[PDB]
Amino acid sequence: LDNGLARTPTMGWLHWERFMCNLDCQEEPDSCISEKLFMEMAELMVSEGWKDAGYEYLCIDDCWMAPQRDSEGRLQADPQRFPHGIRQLANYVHSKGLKLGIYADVGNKTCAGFPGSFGYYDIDAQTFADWGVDLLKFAGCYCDSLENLADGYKHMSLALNRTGRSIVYSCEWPLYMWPFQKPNYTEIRQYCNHWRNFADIDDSWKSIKSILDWTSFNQERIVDVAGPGGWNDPDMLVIGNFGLSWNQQVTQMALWAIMAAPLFMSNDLRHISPQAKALLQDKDVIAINQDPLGKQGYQLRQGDNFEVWERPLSGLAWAVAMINRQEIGGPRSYTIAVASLGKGVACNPACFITQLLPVKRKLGFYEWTSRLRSHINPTGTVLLQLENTMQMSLK
Amino acid sequence: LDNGLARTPTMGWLHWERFMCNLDCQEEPDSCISEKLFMEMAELMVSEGWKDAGYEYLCIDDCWMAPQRDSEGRLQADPQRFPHGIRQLANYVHSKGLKLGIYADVGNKTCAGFPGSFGYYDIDAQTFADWGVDLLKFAGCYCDSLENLADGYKHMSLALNRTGRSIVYSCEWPLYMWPFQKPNYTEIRQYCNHWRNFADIDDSWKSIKSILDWTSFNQERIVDVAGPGGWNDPDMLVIGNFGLSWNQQVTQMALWAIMAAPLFMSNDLRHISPQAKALLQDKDVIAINQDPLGKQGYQLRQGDNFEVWERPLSGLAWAVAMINRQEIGGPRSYTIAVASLGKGVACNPACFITQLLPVKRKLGFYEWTSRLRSHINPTGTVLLQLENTMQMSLKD
Amino acid sequence: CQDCIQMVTDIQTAVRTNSTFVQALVEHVKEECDRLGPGMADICKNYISQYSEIAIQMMMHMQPKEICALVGFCD
Ligand SMILES: *[C@@H]1O[C@H](CO)[C@@H](O[C@@H]2O[C@H](CO)[C@@H](O[C@@H]3O[C@H](CO[C@H]4O[C@H](CO)[C@@H](O)[C@H](O)[C@@H]4O)[C@@H](O)[C@H](O[C@H]4O[C@H](CO)[C@@H](O)[C@H](O)[C@@H]4O)[C@@H]3O)[C@H](O)[C@H]2NC(C)=O)[C@H](O)[C@H]1NC(C)=O
Ligand SMILES: *[C@@H]1O[C@H](CO[C@@H]2O[C@@H](C)[C@@H](O)[C@@H](O)[C@@H]2O)[C@@H](O[C@@H]2O[C@H](CO)[C@@H](O[C@@H]3O[C@H](CO)[C@@H](O)[C@H](O[C@H]4O[C@H](CO)[C@@H](O)[C@H](O)[C@@H]4O)[C@@H]3O)[C@H](O)[C@H]2NC(C)=O)[C@H](O)[C@H]1NC(C)=O
Ligand SMILES: *[C@@H]1O[C@H](CO)[C@@H](O[C@@H]2O[C@H](CO)[C@@H](O[C@@H]3O[C@H](CO)[C@@H](O)[C@H](O[C@H]4O[C@H](CO)[C@@H](O)[C@H](O)[C@@H]4O)[C@@H]3O)[C@H](O)[C@H]2NC(C)=O)[C@H](O)[C@H]1NC(C)=O
Ligand SMILES: *[C@@H]1O[C@H](CO)[C@@H](O[C@@H]2O[C@H](CO)[C@@H](O[C@@H]3O[C@H](CO)[C@@H](O)[C@H](O[C@H]4O[C@H](CO)[C@@H](O)[C@H](O)[C@@H]4O)[C@@H]3O)[C@H](O)[C@H]2NC(C)=O)[C@H](O)[C@H]1NC(C)=O
Ligand SMILES: *[C@@H]1O[C@H](CO)[C@@H](O[C@@H]2O[C@H](CO)[C@@H](O)[C@H](O)[C@H]2NC(C)=O)[C@H](O)[C@H]1NC(C)=O
Ligand SMILES: *[C@@H]1O[C@H](CO)[C@@H](O)[C@H](O)[C@H]1NC(C)=O
């Protein structure tokens, strides 16, 4: 979308994978969906360096609404779970230096059953603008025709523009049309800031595998569409949760850095391991994600349960990720000629290679005819940064 | 098998999941299938307290043999990867106070193309017994017929009885019998110490899911067969590897304690996390698995992505595992009436409940009409031990 | 329900060995495209030349009981 926003991929926090639709504040007050949760999250986003690392958008997913609209036809928050209102929450998030997001749907209803924005596009866009909301995650549940889907997404895209407020417009437009339509992503880039491609992520290595395989299969149609202002959204980061190994978390962080992905956390910042915090606040990996050139990486090759991905970086640099997809055994050795990396120009005539994940170490200079050998853990990813001749005469 | 062995489930160490068939010892000498690997594994099984927990059987899986037999028709190891021989390696294992295991096959070849033992059952049986072998894993790759499979397994069992040495005989009989015929588990219990039922494990949570689902489906066939002497082998333990989370490792340890399963580790003892060491050396969980009553646990309840398993223990004690199979969200609460546990007699009229996994804490006394409430992490398991009115001065 | 679980465990196991019978399975379903009659046969062959390497990968991640539940054999 040509709104001057999402020039780098959007970084922040979303509550759906960790907290879901928890409406029981009587028995579980610390985990139900309330403004207390988001205010504690906004405190920890500054107090733990999440704001310093680049995460800024404290977004809200489903199950924030009252079951009915008000007498004026506007959306209203739940009186028990959000008594002080969305606008006061937005002011508290802006007072902490962060930005606040919110959720809505093109359909009659949202995905949980809360009221959607069909027939109320201008009204709800103005409501989120008056509340001070800086990001919209606009879902596509309970939509009856794809014409209604496309017209609702375009109507909200123009209606948020008519508010005059800078907003981030996250779409689920190609999410609910892939079983029966090939999406024309030029339209989706024209009307959205980033778009959800494949199905919803969960706390499993299965979802990481399926999302990466679907992205690598359709990479001829979605890579060149991605740029500053429009990104491919492979849902949320699930690092810091219950159902991923450490190598699988490293795989998700490295491949989200390669795919120019919007790094939306879904964890509990009150209860997070220091290792997941150090992985999610890695400077040299977020720098790959927030590369100012903003060109999405792609799968270079696959075979022998090995995947090699590369992303062009700004300033004659490249980012190379290698995945061992073999889920049996130990650290497997992989050797690749660096003349095949970066269309033959990434190491012409010499490139310095610095491994960033799973550990930060330097691997010395490699000439054009040289071969790079590394060891990759199963269900793990070795991510590396490659320089070129554009370096000082000091080494 | 009335050999006097495997009265408790067998504890030890196999190599197939972590090291597989690495034969390139020039490029990777530390991680190839050589006697240096097993010597270092025995040294760390003594030095790191793995023996003191209960793991003793340092076993060898496939890819140890020479590509051809010798001039006497006997099996022989690889002369480069095993320069000193199997007998000297077994002496090194016995010098540390451990026991050594080895692998063979009922077919013409093993699963890696190495020579099998079809028509060589007695010869290789006396060869292993003279080398000092205390455990045999017998596979079923490259076997032509079910009659040949059954007769070869019976022949190997009778030959290992004829040697006279105390050898724990592990079989892959119902693993290869199930795709064509319903296995007769009384016969398998008659001839084997423990038998592999489902396919080979890998470093994934999906394999744990499929093994547990298959065990819960066929639990009316394989639970009452299991006792002292005869166990059901799911597969090797994979705790300490690259592909499981902490809660999935907790799930595997608690459920292998519930299922009266053999605890064969398959990891790197040179590179293991302290959390995996503390989980694999949990005294109360191993005491649940090594319970002298020998009755295999069973799935009590399944619903709403929740799984309740229970195992009867000695002294009227019970072990209860609760699994949250929902792989999205945070921890989920679960409340169950304790009168539904242990066929109604586990907490009659009262019972003390002690959580053991994922953390050890005392939950206090619960009556017969009481309801137990708990919280389970996603892909995780809460493991509990319950004692009835068979306790004194611990009741105050 | 359960017969599907046995058959899908068999199909998942047969490529867990990395035998590359993916080509054999694609050739089998391309042969099954001739069951639709001469009109839709080459339509099925065009729709199975693409979208078949990826779909078996989604089925390879998927649990076999989940495959049976999603196609309607169990839930
Ligand atoms: C080759 O195969 C044969 C055939 O099975 C084996 O022979 C068996 O060996 C076991 C050895 O453990 C024998 O079992 C033991 O019997 C002892 C008493 O003998 C008689 O006792 C009563 C009648 O008085 C009968 O019920 C019994 O069958 C015998 O007639 C018991 O005291 C032993 O119990 C001790 O060990 C067990 C572990 O097995 C513990 O659980 C107990 O608590 C206790 O400590 C034991 O039960 C068995 O009788 C033999 N059977 C036959 C037919 O000979 C060979 O051992 C085997 N050889 C090799 C090398 O594998
Ligand atoms: C939000 O919901 C409204 C309707 O509300 C819900 O639907 C009703 C069925 C009923 O259950 C209500 O109680 C409930 O709240 C949706 O609006 C409907 O949109 C459809 C679009 O397909 C309209 O159907 C069309 O109506 C035309 C005349 O009004 C008629 O000419 C059309 O017929 C042609 O097309 C059909 C193809 O479906 C074909 O079969 C015919 O032969 C012919 O070619 C067609 O019937 C409904 O009339 C609309 N309902 C109302 C009350 O206006 C709305 O789409 C939905 N929004 C989203 C995003 O899902
Ligand atoms: C509603 O939609 C309209 C589109 O029809 C949109 O108007 C666009 O606004 C952006 C403002 O961000 C304009 O982009 C600028 O164009 C000027 C040239 O005219 C450039 O100088 C600007 O470049 C600077 O800023 C960039 C960051 O955005 C930097 O990357 C750059 O290096 C410079 O520092 C900038 O590109 C754009 O031209 C218009 N488009 C049109 C057709 O007028 C409007 O903003 C939308 N309104 C809302 C509320 O969303
Ligand atoms: C290891 O490899 C050896 C060598 O291949 C193998 O031994 C062979 O087993 C086959 C079993 O099919 C034997 O073939 C049989 O031979 C007898 C005569 O000796 C025939 O009567 C049999 O014919 C009947 O069965 C056929 C089906 O197989 C029918 O088609 C036919 O009409 C008859 O009903 C049958 O041909 C063969 O003789 C041996 N060869 C030797 C040298 O022993 C052994 O089985 C393999 N072991 C394992 C574990 O796989
Ligand atoms: C996606 O669809 C749109 C149509 O909505 C295509 O845009 C059209 O491009 C032609 C260029 O020849 C223009 O004349 C039309 O005016 C455009 N339509 C609109 C509504 O503006 C677009 O080309 C399609 N994307 C791709 C990649 O083909
Ligand atoms: C299984 O084997 C035992 C002994 O070998 C026998 O008594 C029993 O009848 C067999 N079961 C069946 C179903 O034939």
Residue numbers in the entry:
A (entry chain A): 32 to 426
B (entry chain B): 32 to 427
C (entry chain C): 4 to 78
Copied sentences from the primary study:
Four mature saposins (SapA, SapB, SapC, and SapD) result from proteolysis of the precursor prosaposin as it traffics to the lysosome. The saposin family members are disulfide-linked, four-helix bundles that usually form dimers. SapB presents a variety of ligands to several lysosomal hydrolases, including arylsulfatase A, β-galactosidase (GLB1), and α-galactosidase A (GLA). One cargo, globotriaosylceramide (Gb3), is presented exclusively by SapB to GLA for removal of the terminal α-galactose, and failure of this process leads to accumulation of Gb3 in the lysosome and ultimately results in Fabry disease.
